């Protein structure tokens, strides 16, 4: 159920990464950077980079408050 997922506060970048990649299974980078609060840029990195992710609180927070509405639509 989508009220289970962490509430916006408990994000991480792990979890943003973690969100990002099942979200890639069903839709495209450029589809993703449509919908979510991450730029082009950001995706791009996360996908791509062989180094961790520097993704601000704030930016966690806001991506995770995104997850959770666009989850239960």
């Not at 062989?50 to 666009?70: D, I």
């Amino acid at each position: 159920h989508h009220s289970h997922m962490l509430p916006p506060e408990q994000w991480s970048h792990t979890t943003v990464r973690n969100a990002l990649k099942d979200l890639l299974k069903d839709m495209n980078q450029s589809s993703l950077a449509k919908e979510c609060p991450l730029s082009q840029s950001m995706i791009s990195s996360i996908v791509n980079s062989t180094y961790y992710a520097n993704v601000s609180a704030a930016k966690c927070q806001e991506f995770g408050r995104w997850y959770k509405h666009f989850k239960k639509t």
